Structure 1
Amino acid sequence: EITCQENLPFTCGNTDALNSSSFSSDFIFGVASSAYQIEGTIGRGLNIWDGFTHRYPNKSGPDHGNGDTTCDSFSYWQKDIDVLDELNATGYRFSIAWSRIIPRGKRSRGVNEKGIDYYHGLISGLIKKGITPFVTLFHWDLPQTLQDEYEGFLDPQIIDDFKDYADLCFEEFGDSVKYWLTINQLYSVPTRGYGSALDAPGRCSPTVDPSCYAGNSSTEPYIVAHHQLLAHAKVVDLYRKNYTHQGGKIGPTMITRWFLPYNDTDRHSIAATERMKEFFLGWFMGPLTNGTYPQIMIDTVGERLPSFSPEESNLVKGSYDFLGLNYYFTQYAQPSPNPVNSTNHTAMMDAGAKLTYINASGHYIGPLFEKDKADSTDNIYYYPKGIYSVMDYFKNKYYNPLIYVTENGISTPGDENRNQSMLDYTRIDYLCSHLCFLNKVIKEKDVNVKGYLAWALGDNYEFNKGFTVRFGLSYIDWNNVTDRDLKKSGQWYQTFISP
């Protein structure tokens, strides 16, 4: 019988008690990255994260940081491989920058051979060290040209441009890459990119944020989400019809959270909690498992919710071999009004829920996850049991899928000096406590989880935060980015992997 801790102090950093041998022999352990966050702009065209961070520097991070140079994995990809080799990792998730291989967006405009060569060399280097690549086609970095031609995922033109990009990736890299992710965190671009305008491309209703160049936060999230699902599904169909000889697997990436009632004896909070599951997870998992959006979304969102045709429904339903599930934290849910006629209405209001990290009796859900220095009542707290609850829910609700945990990690402040930054015991605690619950759910609930990739390989540009936080298991000096030095967490993870 497995017992796992939910509160500080944690004792799962002892590899005598928790290590890779606790999991099945074939289980993959590694780390993750994304292209905007690590590569730099050298050698690629411009994408909407370049555009957004440059047009709206205060939205890029408090330091106005961006991905222009970052950790320079364009130059230092071998050093990334070296970290993975030091870890004895068996997996690495990275993304392909669309703008590096097709700078002009549309494949018929030509490819960048040198960009293709960059990923060939990375892939070959990984495989030579026994590391399985997990490759994200689209980690938010849409070529700027496509956003300017037709507003990107706002328009159905995205589907064929994404398909042709993906086809090039399968053609060039699929002989070696056997695990593909289509779109990173399906929920995020619709809501943050087109709802709150916290993320690229930065569209919203005028009264939500007067700096947005255009948008409608009530309608566009739904349009974009719908196009994401269709573009994803078209790529999965292309993969499974035209690249079956490659013997690989493909799936989407979800951001997952668990949700608990703010007041577990209040029917209204219980209802809000179940609505959140539907609106947060079901928005995408309903289509992916059934070809339809959840009924509560149909009912609430009404004419703002697009319909799938019968052909589209069939294309989207079942459009995965596995799910990449990202998991960071859990929220309490309580009811909230949905003012659909307000000029500041957002899609996110349609769930009719307010989310907190403290429940009605004043209980904080778990240890600190992210401090918010401008408003401490907005601090985020984590909840290790949430990974158990999410995986159990996916198994039970969503037809026992094959799952890889494609991100899980925690930040430390960029204000810490290097010695403090390397002494990242809070990261060991977060990672181990989640791994304990992941082992527990696999054993107790028989969830088909076959790997775990911690966020992040190394310090990088963090969307929305610049270089003001660090997520890496290895440390990068922003004054001299060449080295990636394993932190205490990376050293712990090395021991966990090879105990």
Structure 2
Amino acid sequence: EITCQENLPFTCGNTDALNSSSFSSDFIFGVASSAYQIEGTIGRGLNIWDGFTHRYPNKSGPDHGNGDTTCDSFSYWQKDIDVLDELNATGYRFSIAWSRIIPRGKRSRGVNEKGIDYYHGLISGLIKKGITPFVTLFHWDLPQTLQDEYEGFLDPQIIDDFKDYADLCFEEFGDSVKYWLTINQLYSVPTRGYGSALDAPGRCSPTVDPSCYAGNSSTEPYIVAHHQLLAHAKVVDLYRKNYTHQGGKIGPTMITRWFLPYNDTDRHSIAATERMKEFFLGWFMGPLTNGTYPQIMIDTVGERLPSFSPEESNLVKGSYDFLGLNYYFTQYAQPSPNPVNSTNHTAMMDAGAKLTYINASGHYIGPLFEKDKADSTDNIYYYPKGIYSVMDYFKNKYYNPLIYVTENGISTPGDENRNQSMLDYTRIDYLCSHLCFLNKVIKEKDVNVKGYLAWALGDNYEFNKGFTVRFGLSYIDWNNVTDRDLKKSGQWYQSFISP
């Protein structure tokens, strides 16, 4: 019988008690990254994260930091491989920058053969060290041209452009890459890119944020989510019909959270909690397992929710060989009004729920996950058991999928000095506490989880935060980015992997 801790202090950092041998022998362990965050703009065209961070600098991070140079994994990809080799990692999740291989967005406009060669060299170097690539086709960095031509995922033109890009990636890399991810965290671009305008492209309703260049927070998140599902499904169809000879697998990436009632004896809170599961997970998992949105969304969102045609429904239903599930934290849910006629209405208000990290009797859900210096009441707290609850729910509700945990990790402040940043015991605690629960859910519930990829290989540009936080298991000095030095977390993960 496995026991896992939920509260500080944790003791799971002792590899005598928890290590890779705790898991099945074929389980994959590694880390993850994304192209905008690590490569730099050298050698590629511009994308909407270049556009957004330059047009709206105060939304790029408090330091106005961006991915222009970052850790220069364009130049130093071999040092990333060296980190992985040092870890004895068996998987690496990275993303291809669409603007690096098709700068002009539409494939017929030409390919960047030097960009293709960059990924070929990376992929070959990973395989040569025994590392299995998990490659994300689209980690948010859409070519700027496509956003300016037709507003990217707001328009159905995105489907064919995304299909032709994927085709190119399968053609060029699929003989070596056997695990593909389509779109990073389905929920994020519709809500943050088109709803609150915290993320690129930065669209919203005028009274939500006067700085947005255009948008409608109440309708656009649904149109964009719809198109993401259709673009994903068209790419999976292409992969499974035209690249079956490669013997690989493909799936979407979901952002997962667990949700608990703010007040677990109040029926209103309990109902808000179940609504959250449907609005947050079901928005995409409904269509991916059934070809339809959840009925509560159909009922609430009404005319704002697009419909799938019978053909589209069939294309989207079952459009995965696995699910890449990112997991970071859990929230409590309580009821909140949905003012659909307010000029500041957003799609996120349609779930009729307010989300917190503290419940009605004052309990904070778990240890500190992210301190918010402008407002401490907005600090984020984590909950190790949420990864068990999420995996169990996916097995039970969503037809026992094959799952890879594609991201899991925690930041530490960018204000810390190098010595403090290297002594990242809070990261060891976060990672081990989640891995204990992950092993427990695989053993107790038989969830088909086959790998884990911690976020992040090394320090990088963090969406929305610049360089003001660090998520790496290896440290990077912003005054000289060549080296990636394992932190205490990296050193612990090395021992967990090869105990």
Question: TM-score, structure 2 length as denominator?
Answer: 1.00
State the Cα deviation string for residues 358-405 of structure 1 (Å, max 9, x = none).
000000000000000000000000000000000000000000000000
Measure the CA separation in 2 of the matches of 1:88 and 1:268.
49
Measure the CA separation in 2 of the matches of 1:117 and 1:214.
37
State the Cα deviation string for residues 256-306 of structure 1 (Å, max 9, x = none).
000000000000000000000000000000000000000000000000000
The corresponding residue for 2:424 is: 424
1:427, CA displacement in angstroms? 0.1
1:498, CA displacement in angstroms? 0.1
Identity of aligned residues (%): 100
1:194, CA displacement in angstroms? 0.1
State the Cα deviation string for residues 138-195 of structure 1 (Å, max 9, x = none).
0000000000000000000000000000000000000000000000000000000000
State the Cα deviation string for residues 100-125 of structure 1 (Å, max 9, x = none).
00000000000000000000000000
Equivalences, count: 499
1:88, CA displacement in angstroms? 0.1
Measure the CA separation in 2 of the matches of 1:252 and 1:347.
22
1:471, CA displacement in angstroms? 0.1
Measure the CA separation in 1 of the matches of 2:367 and 2:138.
32
Measure the CA separation in 2 of the matches of 1:303 and 1:118.
45
State the Cα deviation string for residues 20-44 of structure 1 (Å, max 9, x = none).
0000000000000000000000000
State the Cα deviation string for residues 69-99 of structure 1 (Å, max 9, x = none).
0000000000000000000000000000000
Measure the CA separation in 2 of the matches of 1:250 and 1:424.
34
Q: Secondary structure at the match of 2:406?
A: strand
1:322, CA displacement in angstroms? 0.0
In structure 1, the gaps of 5 or more residues are none
Measure the CA separation in 2 of the matches of 1:403 and 1:437.
15
Q: Secondary structure at the match of 1:365?
A: coil
Measure the CA separation in 1 of the matches of 2:160 and 2:486.
41
Measure the CA separation in 2 of the matches of 1:158 and 1:108.
14
1:455, CA displacement in angstroms? 0.1
Measure the CA separation in 2 of the matches of 1:84 and 1:284.
32
1:47, CA displacement in angstroms? 0.0
Measure the CA separation in 2 of the matches of 1:163 and 1:76.
30
Measure the CA separation in 2 of the matches of 1:390 and 1:176.
31
Measure the CA separation in 2 of the matches of 1:112 and 1:153.
23
Measure the CA separation in 2 of the matches of 1:23 and 1:259.
27
Question: TM-score, structure 1 length as denominator?
Answer: 1.00
State the Cα deviation string for residues 125-146 of structure 1 (Å, max 9, x = none).
0000000000000000000000
Q: Secondary structure at the match of 1:421?
A: helix
1:413, CA displacement in angstroms? 0.1
Measure the CA separation in 2 of the matches of 1:469 and 1:494.
23
Q: Secondary structure at the match of 2:74?
A: helix
State the Cα deviation string for residues 220-263 of structure 1 (Å, max 9, x = none).
00000000000000000000000000000000000000000000
Q: Secondary structure at the match of 1:29?
A: strand
Q: Secondary structure at the match of 2:75?
A: helix
The corresponding residue for 1:46 is: 46
Measure the CA separation in 1 of the matches of 2:174 and 2:8.
44
Measure the CA separation in 2 of the matches of 1:15 and 1:486.
17
Measure the CA separation in 1 of the matches of 2:346 and 2:438.
34
Measure the CA separation in 2 of the matches of 1:118 and 1:154.
30
Measure the CA separation in 1 of the matches of 2:70 and 2:450.
31
1:8, CA displacement in angstroms? 0.1
The corresponding residue for 1:102 is: 102
The corresponding residue for 1:389 is: 389
Measure the CA separation in 1 of the matches of 2:283 and 2:350.
12
1:496, CA displacement in angstroms? 0.1
Measure the CA separation in 2 of the matches of 1:236 and 1:99.
21
1:423, CA displacement in angstroms? 0.1
The corresponding residue for 1:413 is: 413
Q: Secondary structure at the match of 1:149?
A: helix
Q: Secondary structure at the match of 2:404?
A: strand
Measure the CA separation in 2 of the matches of 1:284 and 1:41.
32
State the Cα deviation string for residues 316-359 of structure 1 (Å, max 9, x = none).
00000000000000000000000000000000000000000000
Measure the CA separation in 1 of the matches of 2:186 and 2:395.
19
The corresponding residue for 1:476 is: 476
**Runs ≥4 residues deviating over 3 A:** none
> Is it true that 1:187 corresponds to 2:199 in the alignment?
no
Measure the CA separation in 2 of the matches of 1:440 and 1:345.
41
Measure the CA separation in 2 of the matches of 1:33 and 1:200.
18
Measure the CA separation in 1 of the matches of 2:339 and 2:213.
23
The corresponding residue for 1:451 is: 451
In structure 2, the gaps of 5 or more residues are none
Measure the CA separation in 1 of the matches of 2:141 and 2:199.
11
Q: 1:430-449 maps to which residues of 2 (within 5 A)?
A: 430-449=430-449
